[PDB]
Design a protein around this ligand. Structure first.
Ligand SMILES: CCCCCCCC/C=C\CCCCCCCC(=O)OC[C@H](COP(=O)(O)O[C@@H]1[C@H](O)[C@H](OP(=O)(O)O)[C@@H](O)[C@H](OP(=O)(O)O)[C@H]1O)OC(=O)CCCCCCC/C=C\CCCCCCCC
Ligand SMILES: CCCCCCCC/C=C\CCCCCCCC(=O)OC[C@H](COP(=O)(O)O[C@@H]1[C@H](O)[C@H](OP(=O)(O)O)[C@@H](O)[C@H](OP(=O)(O)O)[C@H]1O)OC(=O)CCCCCCC/C=C\CCCCCCCC
Ligand SMILES: Nc1nc(=O)c2ncn([C@@H]3O[C@@H]4COP(=O)(O)O[C@H]5[C@@H](O)[C@H](n6cnc7c(N)ncnc76)O[C@@H]5COP(=O)(O)O[C@@H]3[C@@H]4O)c2[nH]1
Ligand SMILES: Nc1nc(=O)c2ncn([C@@H]3O[C@@H]4COP(=O)(O)O[C@H]5[C@@H](O)[C@H](n6cnc7c(N)ncnc76)O[C@@H]5COP(=O)(O)O[C@@H]3[C@@H]4O)c2[nH]1
Ligand SMILES: CC(C)CCC[C@@H](C)[C@H]1CC[C@H]2[C@@H]3CC=C4C[C@@H](OC(=O)CCC(=O)O)CC[C@]4(C)[C@H]3CC[C@]12C
Ligand SMILES: CC(C)CCC[C@@H](C)[C@H]1CC[C@H]2[C@@H]3CC=C4C[C@@H](OC(=O)CCC(=O)O)CC[C@]4(C)[C@H]3CC[C@]12C
Ligand SMILES: CC1(C)C(=O)N(Cc2c(F)cccc2Cl)c2cc(C(=O)NCc3c(F)cc(F)cc3F)ccc21
Ligand SMILES: CC1(C)C(=O)N(Cc2c(F)cccc2Cl)c2cc(C(=O)NCc3c(F)cc(F)cc3F)ccc21
Lengths: 319, 324, 324, 319
């Protein structure tokens, strides 16, 4: 469970499997109560599974009709890779297919039923009856890591935080020697609504600006001088300075907001809120394990309901 | 169809629906030939669809158990949104469930068990599907769902690259190039972005090809971003050597997000494989190409270079686009 | 739900689908009670749906005749796009047409004629529907289609008002107000927009309410737009009288697009009725409210006043929002 | 047929009615050939129409379930207005409904068939089978004038062109007296792709800028001084001035482009192109009839494929 903010969803668990197990127990008890012959039960069950497997075969063929066009670009020119992409594993799938064919032909008309199954399966593709529910899609994305926020969080850590955080420790001490000493941490603001104004004082006038740390420079991706700059802010309580820290907005959140505005992005407000929460979770998880963040940085997540933002930083700064 | 590189896949098309239509026509012709009673055909088709709908109901009920745990964080604390996520649409799904229940209870059936026995078996089979994983999507179906939904990481990386870096710098780039030319051969008036589909992206460009060397940088651009008081955007100028003599000079850079894809491959915590890296690298190029095409700020002031290593041509690749 | 005024309609909801679900449940219960053979029920339901699909095919064929004339101008000169526009989706529609033809030819029927006789009658009835206009949409269905598709004129007017005027001026408005206050009681730091749902909008605001009078204008703002070298955006300052003494002063204007709606009502060539004017005027307010809510440039620097005349309160209405 | 550009679609005609008439003739000839009893033909036809009318009644009831919620806001608190909105005209609809009920009950089970019809109609709403085709929607919008471009064109004429064009004649002469005399017309550019750059020279360097006309001022909508300004441009051919005119981009086209970019607008690229063409057509039609445009303005529509834009203005300027 995340410690940043209550609104952050936890990773999905096994609850579906437990519900399926309860359903299995109930179904078996019901079959025991009904008193129908066990052999007929087994026959019907195996026939149903065989029919499902054959429907899977036909759906895979329909998908293969599409994937073969991409054979060169996506599948590097191998027909077998395309076939596996459509069927998952041709060996296991072929074994189950042969078993299903044998059992469905033996146990019982085969040809008429096969045609009826193909007709049913074709309508599923054309009508779209097998479109997955939002929860099913969300679970698939989270397990596979097919998420916008996943890439943004790793991009943020790999590029910015990985480089600057080690140097941050040295730079802050240099500033304190040159100059009221500032806290020895970088504080990152995570607005779950993705506000992120470019001037921090506009967010809260109690946060006012102070001189900058020494610039950090590095050679990167063919640009010989990438300059990394950090600003210092003072926090006002009762109208006087009550804290001083190096402060940031998570810039990737600004990308999520902009994606929500552009029509070409295909990115909605609901996607923005879900991905914003996900971005916080994965960034929290990575920094926990990351060697670079010994004690160097702090994450602050908040959700505006007259807001406390200045007090929010102070609370963690005092903490 | 992408113009950057032959290997970049085109967006998926309707071919699956065309194959489904061919299959449907063939199945109808086969039923016509078989000569079985039409009423039996219709009855059993409807019964199969009804059984599928009931299995969907039960699977959603199983899913609903997990989502109810997240109700407060993921679904705004409302039960209806949870049920909507699990079942897709309560009204349409309820209508189809009523139809399925009515027709399966009412109609005679010889291929399937009576209603209650059938329901017990259907729940048993759905529980087996859930526990064993017998219904998992194929990787091609997952890819189709992701590309239709825009769930890929490369989509987010490309949009971040456009919104943060290019959208700001490209407008100012013309003025900075004119200033550099007037203050000072004259650099070309475009920014050239290199896209290695293998995601190598060395920091020191000289390491990639000795025929590329570094000149004095463009004037720095500064702007206030995300609560940081103004920060530097900088660009480097390079000269290109043909047989050891300058054939061309240009403003040039690697696409930084490709380094993120490569690093994500190395880190175990990322759950990102090398196969994903190549797939997402191609998708990044395709997405960025589409963005810059429509983007008004990027009209003819930007150019993309995409290549894959087969002694490499890199310096010639940049020269090719410059003289073109 | 809009906050501007009680009379502004909320967006349409799902109530129609809920009523349809209630109807479906009642019909299923009625069929259950009637005790007629289930197979007859299923057969005749399927036959009715098949007849509807064939009628749709014929109607699309009739429509296709008109669209083929426009092929080059409206459909890029491609036949497939014309057929797509007429039939919606060739693949899905073809699948359903094959199903309909197969089942109607194959199944026995007592309520309808044999296949060819039925086809002749169905074409006759569809031709009558087209010629007589017997299938025209009700005005409520047209309104639902328009609001779902965003086909209303008020949508375009609101988006033009936001994109052209407010998006530019509102950011500069703060600096202009600060400049006016420093150069010089002090005007409030917000722009107030008046929205008469009757679309009166007189040019001279003093004519609307003598208690409103005009002060020295804000500094002019100039910018280059649409091939015109810089042009003036100007705003007027007003003072508000309570019992003949200044209670408040503000920057204020009528929403110009409402004059367009009123004028469109007067002009015969516009094909725009007074009933449409009131409907679109409310929709304009609702659309603008939604735009400014999400728009980042309009955060707390803009305010909307909406009212309908029942001796009018106008000056008090502005005062209400100022002190609030 | 529009004279601006070939790409502009003409208003839809009667072709559908002619096709329906041909279909009617073919169906009647087919019925004559089949030789089935005419009385059975009439009975079946009337029963089909009656069933369609009853389905219409039930659909109207389902819609009324929704519209009643809006009774106060949209329908000014009248139940009868809501009922008419759902049914179109309760008198004619009730007459046809009573006739349909009578004929369907008399001619033939009624109750079972009525329930089956209701079940069929309910599925149409829930499944959405009656969603109109794009061409049907487009025809409805064009006839009803439910279009974004319709409002934009009238807004452009009512506000800008109506006011300035009369004054334009006087102002141009004033400029010629003060000062190479410029053409006595306003030229408006209509890019069907909705490009519309803010600086015209950027579109084509052969178009260069020249001093402005005297400013026009007016009192408008509570703003005491609305200033209307027009710029003058010179056109280069063979590298020297070859023309001088007052030149404009149609600003509403810029709105269409921006709407295409914003996600909140629900406006696509295809909508942008269709509405851009429609905007040209309606603006062409209105100015033809409008009293104000005696000879004062010219419309130029072009569609970029290295473009001739400067030559395009010259061609019409020479014309
Ligand atoms: C009485 C019943 C009533 C019901 C209605 C039935 C009426 C059927 C009527 C008419 C058919 C339409 C006109 C035909 C002529 C055009 C064809 C062509 O000659 O065209 C063919 C066309 C190639 O063209 P292309 O070279 O341009 O490639 C384009 C590519 O397809 C696009 O791919 P995609 O759409 O995103 O998937 C891409 O997007 C696009 O890109 P770009 O933007 O550049 O244009 C281009 O590349 O596709 C094909 O080969 C597929 C052709 C086969 C698909 C047929 C579906 C199944 C149909 C019927 C079922 C019966 C089958 C078995 C029957 C025997 C019994 C078992
Ligand atoms: C064995 C079969 C398996 C198949 C599945 C069947 C299972 C059925 C199961 C469970 C039902 C769901 C839980 C029920 C408790 C919640 C209800 C509530 O108590 O709630 C009621 C809720 C009011 O609430 P509310 O005050 O919050 O108003 C909101 C409003 O509705 C929203 O309007 P809309 O959705 O855009 O149309 C607006 O958008 C939202 O706005 P906001 O954003 O502010 O929230 C709010 O205003 O609506 C209603 O009165 C409608 C209630 C009736 C609709 C029922 C549909 C027909 C259903 C079944 C057919 C059988 C009928 C006849 C049967 C007898 C035989 C003839
Ligand atoms: N070649 C190049 N030169 C630049 O100056 C530059 N600036 C940004 N970018 C790249 O474009 C995109 C925009 O960055 P964004 O701010 O949205 O996310 C950035 C941002 O959240 C953070 N970050 C990076 N640099 C800074 C910086 N100087 N100051 C504050 N935050 C920074 O870390 C994220 C990833 O940066 P990069 O992974 O190195 O590549 C970025 C990114 O892909 C640049 N690319
Ligand atoms: N109150 C107010 N003060 C202004 O300065 C102002 N400027 C524009 N607008 C209004 O915002 C909207 C956006 O204008 P757009 O340019 O996109 O369409 C404008 C534009 O295409 C054209 N037009 C109007 N004024 C000018 C002008 N000065 N110069 C060139 N074109 C103009 O005619 C259209 C309708 O103008 P109005 O219908 O009177 O109100 C406009 C409009 O509703 C203003 N509203
Ligand atoms: C399950 C199917 C077969 C039958 C359901 C019929 C009705 C009882 C359903 C249909 C749609 C439902 C409504 C759709 C929308 C809403 C808004 C929804 O919004 C909230 O207030 C909570 C969301 C949030 O927290 O933001 C609350 C439930 C409610 C009233 C629902 C209540 C139950 C309704 C009426
Ligand atoms: C009518 C139904 C029942 C059967 C149709 C089956 C096929 C013959 C159809 C299905 C989709 C069609 C294709 C879908 C997409 C295109 C792209 C389309 O694009 C263009 O080149 C013209 C558009 C333009 O002018 O931009 C040309 C037709 C084509 C090849 C179509 C040809 C005919 C196809 C293969
Ligand atoms: C398309 C066609 C003709 C077909 O090929 N099958 C294969 C098949 C099964 F899928 C299932 C069992 C036997 C056969 Cl033989 C089929 C089945 C039904 C049916 O009524 N299934 C209910 C049902 C069960 F019988 C057992 C179960 F465990 C769950 C369940 F939901 C209707 C039509 C068909
Ligand atoms: C739902 C139910 C039971 C019902 O209420 N009707 C009413 C009705 C008609 F709609 C049409 C005719 C008679 C009746 Cl009685 C119906 C009809 C059919 C059918 O086969 N229609 C073919 C068909 C025709 F018969 C004549 C025609 F001019 C065109 C056409 F397409 C199937 C099921 C039903």
């Amino acid at each position: 469970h995340s410690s940043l903010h209550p609104s952050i969803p936890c990773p999905r668990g096994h609850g579906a499997q437990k519900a399926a197990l309860v359903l299995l127990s109930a179904c078996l008890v019901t079959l025991w109560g009904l008193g129908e012959p066990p052999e007929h039960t087994l026959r019907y069950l195996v026939l149903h599974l065989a029919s499902l497997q054959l429907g899977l075969l036909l759906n895979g063929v329909c998908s293969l009709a599409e994937e073969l066009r991409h054979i060169h670009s996506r599948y590097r020119g191998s027909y077998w890779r395309t076939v596996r992409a459509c069927l998952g594993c041709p060996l296991r799938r072929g074994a189950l297919l042969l078993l299903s064919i044998y059992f469905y032909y033996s146990l019982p008309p085969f040809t008429w039923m096969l045609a009826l199954l193909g007709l049913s399966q074709a309508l599923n593709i054309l009508l779209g009856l097998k479109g997955l529910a939002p929860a099913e899609i969300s679970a698939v994305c989270e397990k596979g890591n097919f998420n916008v926020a996943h890439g943004l969080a790793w991009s943020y850590y790999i590029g910015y935080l990985r480089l600057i955080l080690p140097e941050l420790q040295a730079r802050i001490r240099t500033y304190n020697q040159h100059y009221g000493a500032v806290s020895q941490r970088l504080y990152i603001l995570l607005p779950l609504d993705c506000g992120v104004p470019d001037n921090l004082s506009m967010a809260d006038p109690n946060i006012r600006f102070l001189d900058k740390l020494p610039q950090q420079t590095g050679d990167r991706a063919g640009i010989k001088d990438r300059v990394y700059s950090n600003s210092i802010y003072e926090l006002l309580e009762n109208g006087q300075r009550a804290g001083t820290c190096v402060l940031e907005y998570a810039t990737p959140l600004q990308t999520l907001f902009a994606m929500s505005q552009y029509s070409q992005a295909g990115f909605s407000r609901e996607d923005r809120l879900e991905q914003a929460k996900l971005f916080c979770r994965t960034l929290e998880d990575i920094l926990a394990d990351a060697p670079e963040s010994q004690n160097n940085c702090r994450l602050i997540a908040y959700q505006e309901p007259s807001f406390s933002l200045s007090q929010e930083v102070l609370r963690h700064l005092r903490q």
